[PDB]
Amino acid sequence: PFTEIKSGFLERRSKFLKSYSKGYYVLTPNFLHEFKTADRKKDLVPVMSLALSECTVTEHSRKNSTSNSTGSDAKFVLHAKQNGIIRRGHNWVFKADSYESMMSWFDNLKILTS
Amino acid sequence: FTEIKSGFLERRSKFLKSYSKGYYVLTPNFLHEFKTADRKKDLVPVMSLALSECTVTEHSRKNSTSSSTGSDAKFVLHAKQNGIIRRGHNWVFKADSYESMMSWFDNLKILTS
Amino acid sequence: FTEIKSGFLERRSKFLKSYSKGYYVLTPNFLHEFKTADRKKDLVPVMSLALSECTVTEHSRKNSTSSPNSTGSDAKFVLHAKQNGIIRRGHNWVFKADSYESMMSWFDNLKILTS
Amino acid sequence: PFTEIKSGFLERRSKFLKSYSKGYYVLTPNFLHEFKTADRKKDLVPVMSLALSECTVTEHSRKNSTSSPNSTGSDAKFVLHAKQNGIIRRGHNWVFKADSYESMMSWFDNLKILTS
C-alpha cells in the first residue's frame, strides 16, 4: 500500500548535456523519489531519493512564459541547501506535462520544504 | 502618484530559459512588478526591486541581432547588494522596441545614479 | 599499439557555442585528439588529455531529448577535470558520439581508465 | 597615414543580451580599437581600445565547427580573454564573429602573435 502526496512523470534537465530525461517521480513528505516506471508493485527501488529537508523550490514558469519550445509554461527549479544528490547551492530544473501539473508539483514542494 | 514610467516588460529567467511578461511600475525607489495593469484591484507587487542598490549596465544597440524578437530591445539590471537579486547578479528585460527600451534604460540610469 | 578505442567524436565549445569533430585515440594514459584519421602522416596530437586526473561523470540516457533537428541527444557524455591541465580543475568537456551505443563504448572505456 | 596591422568589421557578442553587435575594428601592435565606421578620416575616436598587453586569444572555431540552422559564422568565431581589469574584467572573455573562417583565422593569428 504505497502512500504518496503526488506522483507522475517529470522530465529532468541535465545542465551539461543540455537534454531532458523522463522519469517517474513520487513525492512524499520526506523525499522526492525518482523511479524508472509507474509500477509500484515491481519497481521498488528508487533511482534516487532527494531529501526534502534540505531542498527548496525557488522559481517556476508563469502561464505566459515563452521561450520557442515544449513546456515553457511547465518548468520549476529545485535548489539544494546541502550536499547530497545535488551539490550545495546547485539547481535542478524539472518539466511537467502542463502549467497546472507544474503548479501542483511546485505548490506541494513549497509546503513540504517551507 | 510619483510613478515615473509604467508598462509591460518581459523578464528573462536564467534557469527556466524563458521570458515572462509582467506589468512594471517604476517609481523613484523601486521597479515594481505586478501581474496586471489594473491599478485599482491589483495592488500587491509580485516583487519590488530597490533601485538604491541596482545599476543598469548594458543595453541592446540599434543594430543588435539574435536568432527571438526584441534583439534591439533588451537591457540589464545589475544588483549591487543582496535582495531580490543576489549581489553581483543580473536580470535581463525585453521591451517592445528599441525606443521603448531606451526610455526604460534612461529613466533607470538616473534613478540608480 | 596499446590503443583502446579510436574514432570520430564531436566536442562542444562552451564559449563558441558549437561542436567541432575530431579524430580521437584513447590510450591507457590519454585521450588524444588528432585532426585526421591518418595514423601514418598525422602524428602530433592537437591535444592530449591526461586520464589520470579526469573522471567521466554523466552521459545521455537512451530516452534523453534535446530539440527537433538537434543531433545526438542520446549520445553525449561529460569529461570532468580533477586538476588544472588542458581543462581547468572543476571544469567539464562535453562530447557527442554517433549513437547511444557508441557513446556507451566511449563512456565505459573511459570509466575504467579514469578509475 | 593611419597605420594598422589589420582592420575590418567584426560582430561582438554580449553574454547577457545574447545578441551580436557589429563594429569596425582596427588592430595595432598596442590595441584592438573599436570604431563605429570604416572612415579613418572623419571617425577618429575609438568607441573603445583594448590593450593587447593584457589580453590573450584562447580558442577559435574550426573549419568544421557547427552550431545550428540557421546561425551564422559557426566557423568564424574567436575568444579574446582578459588578464587584467580594463575594458573587460580580469578573467572574462569576449566572443567575436568574423565574416568567414579565413578572415577569423587572420584575426586570430595576428592577435596571437601580438599577445604572445
Author numbering:
A (entry chain D): 466 to 532, 535 to 581
B (entry chain C): 467 to 533, 536 to 581
C (entry chain A): 467 to 581
D (entry chain B): 466 to 581
Sentences from the paper on this structure:
The PH domain-containing protein Slm1 from S. cerevisiae is a component of the target of rapamycin complex 2 (TORC2) signaling pathway. We have previously reported that in vitro, the Slm1-PH domain (Slm1-PH) interacts with liposomes containing PtdIns(4,5)P2 and DHS-1P cooperatively. The core of each monomer consists of seven antiparallel β-strands with a C-terminal amphipathic α-helix connected via a long and flexible loop.
The results presented here include: (i) the apo structure of Slm1-PH that we resolved at 1.76 Å resolution; (ii) one structure with phosphoserine at 1.68 Å resolution; and (iii) two structures of Slm1-PH in complex with Ins(4)P at 1.4 and 1.8 Å resolution. We previously reported a structure for the apo Slm1-PH (at 2.0 Å) that depicted only part of the non-canonical binding site. As the interactions between the two molecules involve the backbone of β1-β2 and no specific side-chain residue, this probably represents a crystallographic packing artifact. Compared with our previously published structure at 2 Å, our new apo structure clearly visualizes the full β5-β6 loop, which plays a key role in accommodating ligand molecules in the non-canonical binding site (see below). Interestingly for all four structures, much of the binding space in the canonical binding site is occupied by the β5-β6 loop of the neighboring molecule. The long β5-β6 loop occupied part of the space at the canonical binding cavity, making it less available for ligand binding.
